[PDB]
Coordinates of C-alpha atoms and ligand atoms in Angstrom, one line a residue:
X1 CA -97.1 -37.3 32.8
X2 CA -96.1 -36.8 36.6
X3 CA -98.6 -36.2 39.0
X4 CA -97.9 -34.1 42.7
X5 CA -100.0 -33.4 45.1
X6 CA -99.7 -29.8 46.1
X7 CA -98.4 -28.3 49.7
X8 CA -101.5 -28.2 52.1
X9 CA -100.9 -24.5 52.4
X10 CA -101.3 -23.7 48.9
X11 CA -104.7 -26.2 48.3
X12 CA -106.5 -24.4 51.0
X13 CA -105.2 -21.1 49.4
X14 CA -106.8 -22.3 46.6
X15 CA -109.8 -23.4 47.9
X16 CA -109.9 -20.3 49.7
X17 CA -109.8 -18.4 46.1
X18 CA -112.5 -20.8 44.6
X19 CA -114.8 -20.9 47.6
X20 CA -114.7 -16.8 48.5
X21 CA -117.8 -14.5 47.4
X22 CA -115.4 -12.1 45.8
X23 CA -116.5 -10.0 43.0
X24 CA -113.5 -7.9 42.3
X25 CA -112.4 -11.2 39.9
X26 CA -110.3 -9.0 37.6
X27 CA -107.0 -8.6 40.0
X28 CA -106.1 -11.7 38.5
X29 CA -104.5 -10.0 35.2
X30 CA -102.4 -7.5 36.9
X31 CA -100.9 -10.3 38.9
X32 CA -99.6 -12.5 36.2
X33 CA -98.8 -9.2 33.9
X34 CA -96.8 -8.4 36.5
X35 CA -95.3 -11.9 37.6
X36 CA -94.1 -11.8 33.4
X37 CA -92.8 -8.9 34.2
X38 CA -90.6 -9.3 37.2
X39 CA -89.3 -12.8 34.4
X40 CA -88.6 -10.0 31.5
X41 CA -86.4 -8.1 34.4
X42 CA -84.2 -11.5 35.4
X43 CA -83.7 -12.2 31.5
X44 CA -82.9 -8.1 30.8
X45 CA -80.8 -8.6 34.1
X46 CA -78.8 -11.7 33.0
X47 CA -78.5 -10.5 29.0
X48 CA -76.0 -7.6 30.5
X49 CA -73.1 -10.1 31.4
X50 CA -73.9 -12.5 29.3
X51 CA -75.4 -11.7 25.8
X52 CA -75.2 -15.2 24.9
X53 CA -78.9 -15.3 26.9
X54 CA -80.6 -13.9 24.3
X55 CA -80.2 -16.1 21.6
X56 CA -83.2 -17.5 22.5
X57 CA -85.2 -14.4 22.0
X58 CA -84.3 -10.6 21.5
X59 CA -87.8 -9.1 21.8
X60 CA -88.9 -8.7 25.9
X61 CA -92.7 -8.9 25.7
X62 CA -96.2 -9.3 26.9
X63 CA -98.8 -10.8 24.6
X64 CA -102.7 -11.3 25.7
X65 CA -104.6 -13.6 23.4
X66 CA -107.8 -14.9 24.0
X67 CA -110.0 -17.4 22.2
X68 CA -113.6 -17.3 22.0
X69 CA -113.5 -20.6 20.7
X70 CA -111.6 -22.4 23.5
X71 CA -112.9 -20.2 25.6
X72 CA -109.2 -19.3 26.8
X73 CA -107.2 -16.2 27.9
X74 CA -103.4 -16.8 27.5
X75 CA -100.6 -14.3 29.0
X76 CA -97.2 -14.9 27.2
X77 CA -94.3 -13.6 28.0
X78 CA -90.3 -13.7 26.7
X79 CA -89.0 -13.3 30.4
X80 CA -86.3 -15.7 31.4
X81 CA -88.5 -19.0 31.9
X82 CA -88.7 -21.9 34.4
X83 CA -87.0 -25.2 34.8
X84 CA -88.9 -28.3 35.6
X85 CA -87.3 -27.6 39.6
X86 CA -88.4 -23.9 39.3
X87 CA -91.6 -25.3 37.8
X88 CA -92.2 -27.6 40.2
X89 CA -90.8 -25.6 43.6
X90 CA -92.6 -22.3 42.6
X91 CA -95.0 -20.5 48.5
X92 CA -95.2 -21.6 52.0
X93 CA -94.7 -18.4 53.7
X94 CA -96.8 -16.2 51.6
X95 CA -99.6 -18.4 51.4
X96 CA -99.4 -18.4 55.6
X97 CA -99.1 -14.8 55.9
X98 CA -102.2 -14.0 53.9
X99 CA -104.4 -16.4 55.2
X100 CA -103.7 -14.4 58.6
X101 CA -104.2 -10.8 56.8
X102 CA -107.2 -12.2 55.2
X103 CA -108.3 -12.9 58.7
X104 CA -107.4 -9.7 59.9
X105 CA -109.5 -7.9 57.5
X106 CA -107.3 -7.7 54.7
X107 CA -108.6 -9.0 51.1
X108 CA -108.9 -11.0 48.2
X109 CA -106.9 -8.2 46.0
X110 CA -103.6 -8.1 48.5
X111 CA -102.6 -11.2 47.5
X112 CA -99.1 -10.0 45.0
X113 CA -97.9 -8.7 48.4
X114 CA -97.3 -12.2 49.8
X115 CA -95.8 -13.5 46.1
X116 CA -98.7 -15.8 45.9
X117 CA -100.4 -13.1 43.1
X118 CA -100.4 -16.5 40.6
X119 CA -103.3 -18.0 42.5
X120 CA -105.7 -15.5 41.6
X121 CA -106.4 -17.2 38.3
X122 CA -108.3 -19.6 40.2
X123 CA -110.9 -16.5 40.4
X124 CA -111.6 -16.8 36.6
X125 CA -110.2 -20.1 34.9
X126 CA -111.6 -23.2 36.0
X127 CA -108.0 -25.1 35.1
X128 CA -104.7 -23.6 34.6
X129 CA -101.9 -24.6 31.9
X130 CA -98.1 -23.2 32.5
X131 CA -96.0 -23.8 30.0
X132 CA -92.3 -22.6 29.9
X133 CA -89.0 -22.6 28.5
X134 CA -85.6 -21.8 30.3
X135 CA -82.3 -21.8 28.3
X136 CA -80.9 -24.3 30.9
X137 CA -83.8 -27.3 30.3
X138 CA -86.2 -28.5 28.0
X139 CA -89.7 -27.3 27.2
X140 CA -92.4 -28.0 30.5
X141 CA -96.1 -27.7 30.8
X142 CA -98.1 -27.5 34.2
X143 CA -101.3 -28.0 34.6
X144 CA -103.9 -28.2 37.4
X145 CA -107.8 -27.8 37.8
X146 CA -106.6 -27.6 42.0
X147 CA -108.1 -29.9 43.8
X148 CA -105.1 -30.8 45.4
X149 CA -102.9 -32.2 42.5
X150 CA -101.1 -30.5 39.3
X151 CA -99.8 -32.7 36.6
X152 CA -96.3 -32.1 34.9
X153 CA -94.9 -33.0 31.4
X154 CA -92.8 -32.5 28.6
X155 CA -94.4 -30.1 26.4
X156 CA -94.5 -31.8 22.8
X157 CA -96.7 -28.6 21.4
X158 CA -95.1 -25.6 19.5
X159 CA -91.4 -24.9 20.7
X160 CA -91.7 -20.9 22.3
X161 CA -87.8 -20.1 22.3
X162 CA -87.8 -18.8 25.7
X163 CA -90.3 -17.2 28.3
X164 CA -93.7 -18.6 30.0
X165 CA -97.1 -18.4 28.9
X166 CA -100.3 -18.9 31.1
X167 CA -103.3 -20.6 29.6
X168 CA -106.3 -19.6 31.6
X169 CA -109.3 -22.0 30.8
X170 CA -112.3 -19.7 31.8
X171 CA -115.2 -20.6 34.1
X172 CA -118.5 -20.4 31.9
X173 CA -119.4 -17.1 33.8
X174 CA -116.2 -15.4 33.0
X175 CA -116.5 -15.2 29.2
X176 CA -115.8 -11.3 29.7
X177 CA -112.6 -11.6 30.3
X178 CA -112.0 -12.7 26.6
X179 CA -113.8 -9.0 24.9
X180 CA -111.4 -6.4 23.7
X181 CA -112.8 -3.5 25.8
X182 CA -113.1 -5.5 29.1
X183 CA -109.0 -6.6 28.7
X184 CA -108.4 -3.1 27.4
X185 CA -110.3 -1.0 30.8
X186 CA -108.4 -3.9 33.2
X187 CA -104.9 -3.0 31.6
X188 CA -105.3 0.4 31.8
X189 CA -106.5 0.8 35.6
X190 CA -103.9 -1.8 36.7
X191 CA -100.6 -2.3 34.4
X192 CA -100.3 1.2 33.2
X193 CA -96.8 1.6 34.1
X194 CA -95.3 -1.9 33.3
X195 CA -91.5 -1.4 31.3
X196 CA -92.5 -4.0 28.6
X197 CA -95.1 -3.9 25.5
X198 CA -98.3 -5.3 26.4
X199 CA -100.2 -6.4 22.8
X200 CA -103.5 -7.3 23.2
X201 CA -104.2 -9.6 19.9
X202 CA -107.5 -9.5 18.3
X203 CA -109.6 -12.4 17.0
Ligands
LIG301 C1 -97.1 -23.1 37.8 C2 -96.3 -21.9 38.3 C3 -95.1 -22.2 38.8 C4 -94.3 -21.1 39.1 C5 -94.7 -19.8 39.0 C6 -95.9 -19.5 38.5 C7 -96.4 -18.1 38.5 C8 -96.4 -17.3 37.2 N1 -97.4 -16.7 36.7 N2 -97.1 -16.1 35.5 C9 -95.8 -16.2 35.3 C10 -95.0 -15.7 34.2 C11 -93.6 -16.0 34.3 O1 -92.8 -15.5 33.3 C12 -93.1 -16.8 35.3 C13 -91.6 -17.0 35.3 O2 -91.1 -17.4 34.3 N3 -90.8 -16.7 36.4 C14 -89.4 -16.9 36.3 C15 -91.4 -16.3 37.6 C16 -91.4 -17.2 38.7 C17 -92.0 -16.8 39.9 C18 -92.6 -15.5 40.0 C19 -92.5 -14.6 38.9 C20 -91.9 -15.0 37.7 O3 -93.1 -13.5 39.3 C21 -93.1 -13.5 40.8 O4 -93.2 -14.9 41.1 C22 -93.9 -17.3 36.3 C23 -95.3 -17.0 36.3 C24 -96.8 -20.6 38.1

C-alpha cells in the first residue's frame, strides 16, 4: 500500500467541497457519468486503428449499482482505464481557476468546467475507492477519505477487463442517493443525452 499526500491545491479544493453549505449535493453524478464518458470516447477513439483494444471488452457502458447494505453507490464504466501514472497524476490549474470563480460568485455546480468535476463526490461519500484497469498495466485501486492523503495499491479483488469504476462510500445523511427513483430523477435532469447505456441495477 503506498501512501501520497495530495497537491495543496486539490486538499483545500476538497476541504472547500466538505466544508461548503451547499445543498445542490446531486451534481456529483453527472460529473463522474460524464468523466466515464469522455473514458468510453478515448477507448471508441483508439478501437478504430487498432481493434486489438478491445479485447479486453466489446461492450462501452455505464452501470450504477448501489448497495443498501454497504451503504455504497458505485459508477462503472468500460472506457479505456488508468495506469498507476494516470492514476496517480490525474489538476493544478482547474483547481486554481475555480477557487477564483467560486470567489467571484460562481458555484459549487461549475466545477466540470475546470476538469476538477471528480471532486464533487466529496459532497456525498465520506471516502472514495477508484479502481481501474488499462490494457497497458495491471489492475489499481485508489482510495482516500481526503484529508490530505490517498492511498494506492494493487487491486487483488475481482479482475474488471478494462474500464474504471467509482465506489462512493456515502455519508450517513446521503442514503438517498442509493433509491431507485432519486438515481432515476438525477439521470434524467442531468445525463440525458450521454452516447453510452446508462443501467441502473436494482437490489
Ligand atoms: C482517483 C482519480 C484519478 C484520476 C481521475 C479520476 C476521475 C474519474 N472519475 N470517474 C472516472 C471514470 C473514468 O473512466 C476515468 C478514466 O478512466 N479516465 C481515463 C479519465 C481520466 C480523467 C478524466 C476523465 C476520464 O474524465 C475527465 O477527466 C476517470 C474518472 C479519479
Amino acid at each position: 500500500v503506498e501512501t501520497f499526500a495530495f497537491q495543496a491545491e486539490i486538499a483545500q479544493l476538497m476541504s472547500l467541497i466538505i466544508n461548503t453549505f451547499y445543498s445542490n449535493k446531486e451534481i456529483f453524478l453527472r460529473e463522474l457519468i460524464s468523466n466515464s464518458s469522455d473514458a468510453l470516447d478515448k477507448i471508441r477513439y483508439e478501437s478504430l486503428t487498432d481493434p486489438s483494444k478491445l479485447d479486453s471488452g466489446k461492450e462501452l457502458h455505464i452501470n450504477l449499482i448501489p448497495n443498501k447494505q454497504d451503504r455504497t453507490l458505485t459508477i462503472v464504466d468500460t472506457g479505456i482505464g488508468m495506469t498507476k501514472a494516470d492514476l496517480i497524476n490525474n489538476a493544478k490549474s482547474g483547481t486554481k481557476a475555480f477557487m477564483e470563480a467560486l470567489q467571484a460568485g460562481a458555484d459549487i455546480s461549475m466545477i466540470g468546467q475546470f476538469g476538477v468535476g471528480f471532486y464533487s463526490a466529496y459532497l456525498v461519500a465520506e471516502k472514495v475507492t477508484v479502481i481501474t484497469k488499462h490494457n497497458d498495466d495491471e489492475q489499481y485501486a485508489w482510495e482516500s477519505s481526503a484529508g490530505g492523503s490517498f492511498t494506492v495499491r494493487t487491486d487483488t479483488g475481482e479482475p474488471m477487463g478494462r474500464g474504471t469504476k467509482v465506489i462512493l462510500h456515502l455519508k450517513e445523511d446521503q442514503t438517498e442517493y442509493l433509491e431507485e427513483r432519486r438515481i432515476k430523477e438525477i439521470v434524467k435532469k442531468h445525463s440525458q443525452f450521454i452516447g453510452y447505456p446508462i443501467t441502473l441495477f436494482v437490489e
